[PDB]
């Protein structure tokens, strides 16, 4: 896209010279951006997922895959097979194309922004993120909305540990605190 | 006088017929075709060379020969095979 052409030669050399890498592959690469929201409260209405599914489809240009309840839980009053959330997994140009718009024209519209948390890592160099509101994207009209739907975005990387996971995102100007 | 005291019952005490499962032709027996070697309920013995498996998992011969018991396989699961006589 308009970020991949940058990574293939620049971020490589910003890390090959940094982390003492003799190979263009010991450096990590970011391979997929999974993305999903768990609607959860769709027990009252199916329209709370019929219209919500069009929200990920309006952010990612991919029709979402509805997820389902893996195991019945009495407390949440669900059983196997409920559609309780939509999920999108992005790879390739659509991975990079969305990666471009999020860290450029979607992050700076977060209300009360004071940097990006850095301790949210899973010991293997993957990033997880929330937004708490979906109107921060330029694909939501404020008139098609009825709730405050949030998201969970989990950047999944091939880095072998967390401490270099920051470097992969930092070289893309990731607003770590 | 209080001679005979009342007695209770038993909630259980029912059972079913025996199905006579087992091995009908032990190893080294010359056996004909289509005859029954071992009766199963699962598959404790699998089907090797020249033998088959019924819907009951009954193992039957396919061609005449001798009965062979063997333990080939990565998971050490027992087979049955029939030679060529």
């Amino acid at each position: 896209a308009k970020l991949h052409d940058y990574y293939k030669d620049e971020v490589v050399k910003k890390l090959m010279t940094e982390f003492n890498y003799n190979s263009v592959m010991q450096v990590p690469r970011v391979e997929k951006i999974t993305l999903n929201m768990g609607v959860g409260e769709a027990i009252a209405d199916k329209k709370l997922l019929d219209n919500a599914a069009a929200d990920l489809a309006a952010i990612s240009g991919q029709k979402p895959l509805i997820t389902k309840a893996r195991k019945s839980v009495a407390g949440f009053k669900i059983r196997q097979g409920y559609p309780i959330g939509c999920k999108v997994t992005l790879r390739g140009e659509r991975m990079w194309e969305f990666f471009e718009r999020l860290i450029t024209i979607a992050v700076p519209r977060i209300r009360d922004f004071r940097g990006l948390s850095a301790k949210s890592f899973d010991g293997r160099g993957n990033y997880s993120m929330g937004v708490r509101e979906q109107i921060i994207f330029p694909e939501i009209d404020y008139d098609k909305v009825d709730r405050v739907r949030g998201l969970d975005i989990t950047i999944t990387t091939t880095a072998k540990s967390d401490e270099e996971g920051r470097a992969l995102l930092a070289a893309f100007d990731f607003p770590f605190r | 006088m209080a001679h005979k005291k009342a007695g209770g019952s038993t909630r259980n005490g029912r059972d079913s017929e025996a199905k006579r499962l087992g091995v009908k032709r032990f190893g080294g027996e010359s056996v004909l075709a289509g005859s029954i070697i071992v009766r199963q309920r699962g598959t404790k013995f699998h089907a090797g060379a020249n033998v088959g498996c019924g819907r009951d998992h009954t193992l039957f011969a396919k061609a005449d020969g001798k009965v062979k018991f063997e333990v080939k396989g990565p998971k050490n699961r027992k087979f049955i095979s029939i030679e060529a006589e």
Binding site: - | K4, K5, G7, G8, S9, T10
Partner: protein, 136 residues
């Protein structure tokens, strides 16, 4: 009282009591009470032989109970004719073979141990003996 919590099946067959024991050697404490006879050792003889041990040294050391009943014993009521089921469960016993270390103690001097053990054995229906841990 040393009665099991949450067994799998309520009633159990009588069985037999043959062979020797397994816990033949002192392992936790420093002195132990070994059994020379065979028999079934109920849950109340275990307790009455544990009061007679605690109340002897009166505070000191630890007392280990190496055995646990986990074996129901059923008894028909008075004046019942035979059959019509199996007896309802009454109490729990542990089966004892020769050479099984029943109780064992630590932190008490040997001469105090001998008299303390000699007072518990009086409450058990089997001929016991006093044994001493060895390097092995």
């Amino acid at each position: 009282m040393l009665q099991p919590k949450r067994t799998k099946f309520r009633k159990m067959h009588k069985g037999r009591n043959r062979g020797l024991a397994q816990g033949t050697d002192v392992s936790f404490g420093s002195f132990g009470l070994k059994a020379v006879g065979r028999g079934r050792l109920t849950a109340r003889q275990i307790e009455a032989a544990r009061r007679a041990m605690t109340r002897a040294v009166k505070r000191q050391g630890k007392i280990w109970i190496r055995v646990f009943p986990d074996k129901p014993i059923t008894e028909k009521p008075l004046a019942v004719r035979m059959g019509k089921g199996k007896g309802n469960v009454e109490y729990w016993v542990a089966l004892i073979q020769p050479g099984k270390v029943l109780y064992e103690m630590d932190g008490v001097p040997e001469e105090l141990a001998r008299e303390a053990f000699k007072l518990a054995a009086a409450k058990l229906p089997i001929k016991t003996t006093f044994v001493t841990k060895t390097v092995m």
